[PDB]
Design an enzyme around this catalytic site. Structure first.
Site, short mmCIF file in Angstrom:
data_model
loop_
_atom_site.label_atom_id
_atom_site.label_comp_id
_atom_site.label_asym_id
_atom_site.label_seq_id
_atom_site.Cartn_x
_atom_site.Cartn_y
_atom_site.Cartn_z
N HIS A 70 0.99 -1.41 0.04
CA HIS A 70 0.07 0.06 -0.11
C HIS A 70 0.88 1.32 -0.16
O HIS A 70 1.97 1.19 0.27
CB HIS A 70 -1.08 0.11 1.12
CG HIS A 70 -1.53 -1.44 1.56
ND1 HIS A 70 -1.77 -1.90 2.50
CD2 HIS A 70 -2.61 -1.88 0.80
CE1 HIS A 70 -2.40 -2.94 2.39
NE2 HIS A 70 -2.96 -3.07 1.39
N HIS A 114 1.30 4.77 1.67
CA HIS A 114 0.58 5.29 2.90
C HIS A 114 0.65 6.90 2.79
O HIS A 114 1.34 7.33 1.98
CB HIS A 114 1.66 4.88 4.03
CG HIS A 114 1.22 3.51 4.49
ND1 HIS A 114 1.35 2.88 5.83
CD2 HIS A 114 0.81 2.41 3.93
CE1 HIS A 114 0.87 1.77 6.04
NE2 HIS A 114 0.57 1.42 4.66
N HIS A 171 -3.30 4.65 5.40
CA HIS A 171 -3.30 4.47 3.84
C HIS A 171 -3.68 5.75 3.23
O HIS A 171 -4.72 6.48 3.59
CB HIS A 171 -4.27 3.43 3.38
CG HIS A 171 -3.81 2.01 3.75
ND1 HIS A 171 -4.10 0.70 3.38
CD2 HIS A 171 -2.61 1.85 4.68
CE1 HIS A 171 -3.73 -0.18 3.98
NE2 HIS A 171 -2.69 0.10 4.56
N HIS A 185 -11.29 0.75 3.06
CA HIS A 185 -10.21 0.00 2.57
C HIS A 185 -10.90 -1.18 1.70
O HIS A 185 -11.82 -1.77 1.99
CB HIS A 185 -9.25 -0.88 3.44
CG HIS A 185 -8.61 -1.75 3.16
ND1 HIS A 185 -7.27 -1.38 2.45
CD2 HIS A 185 -8.56 -3.09 2.79
CE1 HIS A 185 -6.66 -2.43 2.33
NE2 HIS A 185 -7.32 -3.52 2.54
N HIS A 245 -9.19 2.63 -0.95
CA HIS A 245 -8.29 3.94 -0.66
C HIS A 245 -7.72 4.03 -1.94
O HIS A 245 -7.21 3.08 -2.33
CB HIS A 245 -7.10 3.74 0.68
CG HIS A 245 -8.00 3.39 1.94
ND1 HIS A 245 -7.56 2.57 2.75
CD2 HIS A 245 -9.39 4.03 2.47
CE1 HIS A 245 -8.50 2.36 3.76
NE2 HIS A 245 -9.50 3.38 3.67
N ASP A 258 -4.65 1.88 -1.99
CA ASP A 258 -4.89 0.36 -2.15
C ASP A 258 -4.30 -0.44 -3.28
O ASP A 258 -5.19 -0.52 -4.18
CB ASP A 258 -6.23 -0.05 -1.81
CG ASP A 258 -6.88 0.36 -0.45
OD1 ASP A 258 -5.90 0.23 0.52
OD2 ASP A 258 -7.96 0.38 -0.17
N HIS A 296 3.61 -5.14 3.45
CA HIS A 296 3.48 -5.56 4.86
C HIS A 296 3.96 -7.18 5.19
O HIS A 296 4.37 -7.87 4.36
CB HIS A 296 2.06 -5.67 4.94
CG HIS A 296 1.54 -4.27 5.09
ND1 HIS A 296 1.51 -3.51 6.51
CD2 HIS A 296 0.90 -3.36 4.36
CE1 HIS A 296 1.19 -2.36 6.29
NE2 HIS A 296 0.57 -2.21 5.19
N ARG A 314 4.59 -3.52 9.26
CA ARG A 314 5.39 -2.82 7.99
C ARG A 314 6.59 -3.27 7.97
O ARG A 314 7.72 -2.90 8.71
CB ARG A 314 5.19 -1.38 8.10
CG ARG A 314 3.75 -0.88 8.05
CD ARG A 314 3.60 0.56 8.46
NE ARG A 314 2.39 0.94 8.80
CZ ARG A 314 1.88 2.14 9.11
NH1 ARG A 314 2.68 3.18 8.90
NH2 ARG A 314 0.44 2.31 9.37
#
Ligand SMILES: [Cu+2]
Ligand SMILES: [Cu+2]
Ligand SMILES: [Zn+2]
Ligand SMILES: [Zn+2]
Lengths: 151, 151
Positions: free
Chosen positions: A44, A46, A61, A69, A78, A81, A118, A141
């Site tokens: 993602h 951020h 995000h 999400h 988002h 995403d 992630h 993360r």
């Protein structure tokens, strides 16, 4: 910029180089991430390009349109995403995404923001719980980097 | 885009966090850099936010007006020419700069570009050799980071 790049680095073994190129009203994302556990990993964008506290300071995000999400294909997602990147048994994940929502210019450009890969897979807002429609349950993360302008 | 941040990293002990804030019609740069040798060190914004090859891939100084290298107070300078930061004997350099050419939005935006702190002093383009007109003979890049959007 019609081109951007991001070098992912973390405290563990995960690292990678991600490339971005504007094409039409889409952004073509390419590159690879190494040191990953076999299987899927959330990927993602951020909100902040702040690495003062590792990948935590990157914030939520990137969600300028205030939606829940979701997955890259979902209308309710988002901007940040981008779904999941899949790592092979050797722990290398070849990235190849064509996204219609992220951009490299304008009000909601992702340049200057953070790319994050992630620990766990992203359930695309379909896990049932509440952590599913906020982060998709991707976990900590592993690696991240600020998205920069590329030649 | 009113605030930005940059975390400087390198192969060595030099590190630091730089903050940028759009105040009024200018940009205030603050923060500190540690692990430096006592004395002056070139401090510039390089064109690309590309760290794929360490600080090397950041390219030349940000120079949208196609000028020669100079000091921050000169008419003839690169937009990325922020002069020198000065480290005390403990190796700490406190950054307090206000600059008229850089910005955090538009043509002169440094968001997505790379901040670099050099091994040697920037001669402000007055060294007398060709290199002075390009980099001020500031030498190698000790630490760098991509400038990201901050909260
Ligand atoms: Cu995420
Ligand atoms: Cu420089
Ligand atoms: Zn999300
Ligand atoms: Zn210069």
């Amino acid at each position: 910029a019609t081109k951007a790049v991001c070098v992912l680095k973390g405290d563990g073994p995960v690292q990678g180089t991600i490339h971005f190129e504007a094409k039409g009203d889409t952004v073509v994302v390419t590159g690879s991430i190494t040191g990953l556990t076999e299987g899927d990993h959330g990927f993602h964008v951020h909100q902040f390009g702040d690495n003062t506290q590792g990948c935590t300071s990157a914030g939520p995000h990137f969600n300028p349109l205030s939606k829940k999400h979701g997955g890259p294909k979902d209308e309710e997602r988002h901007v940040g995403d981008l779904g999941n990147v899949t790592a092979d048994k050797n722990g290398v994940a070849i990235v190849d995404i064509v996204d219609p929502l992220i951009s490299l210019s304008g009000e909601y450009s992702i340049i200057g923001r953070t790319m994050v890969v992630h620990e766990k897979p992203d359930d695309l807002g379909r896990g049932g719980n509440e952590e599913s429609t906020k982060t998709g349950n991707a976990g900590s993360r592993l690696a991240c980097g600020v998205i920069g302008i590329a030649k």
